Amino acid sequence: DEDETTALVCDNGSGLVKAGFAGDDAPRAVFPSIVGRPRHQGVMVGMGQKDSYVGDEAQSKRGILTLKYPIEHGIITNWDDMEKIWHHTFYNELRVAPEEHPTLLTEAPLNPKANREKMTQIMFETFNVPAMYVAIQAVLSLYASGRTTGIVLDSGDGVTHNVPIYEGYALPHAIMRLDLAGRDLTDYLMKILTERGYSFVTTAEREIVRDIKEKLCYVALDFENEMATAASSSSLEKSYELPDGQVITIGNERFRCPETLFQPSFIGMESAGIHETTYNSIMKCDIDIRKDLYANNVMSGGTTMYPGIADRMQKEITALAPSTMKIKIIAPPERKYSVWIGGSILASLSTFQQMWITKQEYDEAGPSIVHRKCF
């Protein structure tokens, strides 16, 4: 299927795995990060004895399979799910073995050392891979953006990373990760919908309402004013049609769901909102480059697909920062895949072909030394 000896770019982002060959502009195999295990034991004869579903095979059946998240906040919980999702991506979709081409994986900023050593060991010992490389997502996203300056805000599913890069210079001391993202928003919407009257307590419905949020939920331009005008609703409340057919009616809750990002007090945490944390990060940077960080801020992550984030960011930053300079916020189209796109354009360089880590040196050095070599 592939006639070019190039690394397979597999972005294992929290919530959605995006795998594809280098050189492509979009991932071909896109599936959620979920593992469906058989809950009961059947006396039936003939069905697949497979004890571990994955991807679309699990999405197609969520009532029988108990759903487990292979990644939580960033820390890898179960490694069997890791081996399952890579083995599946290798021998069920791509139809190619890892013994013929490299593999450029993308990991989140500020992750545990155990996670890195574990994935590297599974990719070297178990699977025979000629060479591995771990890369931070923020750099590849800035590559795909086509710039060298700005602060990347990557909001995945269970973690949110703010990474400032000015003139192509990383700042490992300022990268601050906060576990507020799509899962805590799904939980907030679920508890407020339970407050509305429709109560559910199973994961399949949680994924359904997550999809409903992805499709409908947006960000408000003025929270309190929308609350007042929605008190007497007319066009502000919408009636959604569940894929099963049950008629759901959702009004203001939509534009109050992502608001939890701006007010973490809703989930009883002393952490500051994403905008205030980004602002504090800007103060932690130097003054000289602060204006450039204001003018080149970039966004990444699937959570940014909601309509109305750019305007909300502009008003909040204008209210926090002075209103004398110019603070333009740029969001490139299809930003979610941009990271992966970067991977593709990063795997075609010959120099990058010279910066890989082969098996033998890793085996003698050991995983810890490999950690030192990368950084």
């Binding site: 309509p307 109305g308 305007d311």
Partner: protein, 69 residues
Amino acid sequence: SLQKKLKGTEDELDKYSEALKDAQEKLELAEKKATDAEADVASLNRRIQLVEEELDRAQERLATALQKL
């Protein structure tokens, strides 16, 4: 004879049901895409009005700064 006719009619019924389900799936996909595109159009119209207001502000500011110069 009537059993053969009923068998044929039931086969045609199954075919029509399959075609109707396929058409309903396509209708869902198309309506979702249309609604998403309409929402994007509305949001971007708001955006471009805001940007035009900003451009007018910048032009007036420039004219004032020029006069002062």
